[PDB]
Design a protein around this ligand. Structure first.
Ligand SMILES: CCCCCCCCCCCCCCCCCC(=O)OC[C@H](COP(=O)([O-])OCC[N+](C)(C)C)OC(=O)CCCCCCCCCCCCCCCCC
Ligand SMILES: CCCCCCCCCCCCCCCCCC(=O)OC[C@H](COP(=O)(O)OCCN)OC(=O)CCCCCCCCCCCCCCCCC
Ligand SMILES: Nc1nc2c(ncn2[C@H]2C[C@H](O)[C@@H](COP(=O)(O)OP(=O)(O)OP(=O)(O)O)O2)c(=O)[nH]1
Ligand SMILES: CCCCCCCCCCCCCC
Lengths: 57, 368
């Protein structure tokens, strides 16, 4: 490419393969955040950490 | 307040009693359930009173049986030293520091001049507070009145009795006065009080009617101390309460009988104080609307952690009520690692509780 065309700069040709964590990172991080939030709830109410697994699930 | 005999039988409720120990009453629960649909002439707070030894427990139980009321005995320190699993925490004192050791009523009687005794007096007031809301949860939510063996209003006289005898300093008196000014204004004054008047010597004779060892080998039960309680009661406390509650004073030198004490209650007209809306008698217990009744029931059911968190005041100038930080950490690692209080009392696997894997319920107004 002897010129830097902005149309050619912005058009997704498809040569960028997404990563392994690209479709899966946000649901597993939000699930870990939810499990940790339920753990933190059970810790602050002086329960066992893995006592109520209904809240965890 | 009609008794069992004039009513023709057992008391019938005016409506269904609210499960206040199981269902949480809040603002959104106040629409469907109303407070004043259960109130009647029997829905009044009666506090029996008196000196150290006056037969308050048997007389209060008989008054609860005859008037169809709930009996509430005087709170002792076995409510927190013995937890919900029955483990007494008085056996933890070798591991605990000497400023963090167990101190109960018999420890006051054997050692009056100890520092933590002042703490004990403050602790007793909190325990009385911890039953009085439990009194006011019973009157407002179910509609059945209660009888109290002693009152949180009736506990500053014990503080001044220790102070004039020399068991408390000026600092502990100022601290307990500050907690009383912080906390007593949120309570409703009782409807009726019964004081069992006794002389200073005869109570000592009633000490020999009990024959317990720690109250006969002690030092506090003397002539000046019981006279100090009698003077404090009859010159400050009953005169302060008689502007709100109908006071009944009986002489209890003899054995007495609870039926004439019942029959003096129905001779009192409780509707004569409702003619004036600014009357000092029954002022805290009158409510012009159903929404004010539900407002008080919300304050006394959903805001019991509020009234228990009003005790969090800072006072560091005294050296009797300040726990050392190394002693505090040692006390935490002994007391909270003990069997029966490692976790919340529902979820304790060490004491045989089963089904913890699917349990997510907690107690309403429960000490953690
Ligand atoms: C420090 C604590 C807070 C750190 C916040 C940022 C951490 C990195 C991160 O989340 O990057 C997102 C990026 C996401 O980029 P990506 O390449 O996975 O792309 C996926 C992006 N979505 C889902 C939006 C399409 O994570 C990574 O690149 C890999 C992270 C690996 C795990 C890192 C853990 C760090 C733990 C630190 C604890 C201390
Ligand atoms: C998978 C590993 C994930 C690592 C990421 C960080 C996790 C941090 C710990 C989360 C779990 C936790 O808090 O466990 C505490 C608990 C303490 O045990 P305790 O009950 O106090 O006493 C045992 C005797 N009864 O510990 C135990 O009982 C042992 C637990 C071992 C396994 C730990 C992880 C299990 C939970 C799944 C992942 C949760 C991630 C939470 C992340 C929060 C911050 C983002
Ligand atoms: N230090 C202290 N002791 C108290 C306090 N309240 C009660 N006591 C002690 C004093 C006596 O040892 C004992 C007497 O209890 P009460 O006077 O409440 O009556 P008692 O338990 O004897 O019941 P009774 O009247 O006999 O039915 O309790 C208090 O606030 N401080
Ligand atoms: C494309 C589908 C994605 C589904 C979500 C990602 C996997 C989640 C696995 C479980 C994560 C939480 C474990 C505690």
């Amino acid at each position: 490419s002897a010129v830097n065309d902005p149309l050619e700069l912005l058009t997704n040709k498809g040569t960028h393969e997404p990563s392994f964590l690209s479709p899966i990172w946000n649901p597993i991080a939000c699930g870990v955040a939810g499990v940790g939030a339920a753990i933190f709830i059970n810790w602050g109410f002086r329960k066992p950490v893995f006592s109520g697994i209904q809240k965890h699930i | 307040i009609s008794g069992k005999t004039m009513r023709g039988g057992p008391r019938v409720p005016k409506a269904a009693p609210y499960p206040y120990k199981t269902k949480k009453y809040s603002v959104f629960n106040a629409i469907f359930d109303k407070t004043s649909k259960r109130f009647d002439e029997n829905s009044k707070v009666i506090c029996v009173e008196g000196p150290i030894a006056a037969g308050k427990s048997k007389f209060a139980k008989e008054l609860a049986e005859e008037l169809d009321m709930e009996y509430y005995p005087a709170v002792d320190l076995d409510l927190i030293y013995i937890n919900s699993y029955g483990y007494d925490m008085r056996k933890l004192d070798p591991q605990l520091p000497p400023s963090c050791r167990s101190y109960d009523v018999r420890n006051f009687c054997l050692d009056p001049s100890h520092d933590l005794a002042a703490q004990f007096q403050i602790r007793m007031y909190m325990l009385r507070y911890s039953q009085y809301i439990d009194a006011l949860q019973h009157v407002l939510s179910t509609g059945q009145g209660v009888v109290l063996e002693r009152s949180p209003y009736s506990d500053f006289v014990f503080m001044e009795a220790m102070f004039r005898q020399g068991y408390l300093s000026r600092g502990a008196r100022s601290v307990y006065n500050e907690l009383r000014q912080n906390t007593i204004g949120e309570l409703l004054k009782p409807h009726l009080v019964i004081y069992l008047d006794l002389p200073v010597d005869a109570v000592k004779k009633q000490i020999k009617a009990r024959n317990v060892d720690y109250e006969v080998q002690s030092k506090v039960f003397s002539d000046a101390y019981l006279s100090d309680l009698e003077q404090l009661y009859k010159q400050q406390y009953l005169k302060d309460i008689s502007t709100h509650a109908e006071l009944l004073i009986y002489d209890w030198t003899a054995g007495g009988e609870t039926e004439v004490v019942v029959e003096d209650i129905e001779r009192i007209d409780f509707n004569q104080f409702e003619a004036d809306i600014h009357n000092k008698k029954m002022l805290d217990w009158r409510f012009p609307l159903e929404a004010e009744w539900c407002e008080a029931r919300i304050k006394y059911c959903h805001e019991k952690p509020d009234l228990m968190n009003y005790f969090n005041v800072p006072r560091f100038d005294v050296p009797e009520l300040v726990r050392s930080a190394d002693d505090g950490k040692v006390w935490r690692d002994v007391w909270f690692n003990a069997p029966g209080m490692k976790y919340r009392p529902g979820y304790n696997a060490d004491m045989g509780d089963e089904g913890l894997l699917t349990k997510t319920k907690i107690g309403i107004n429960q000490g953690i």
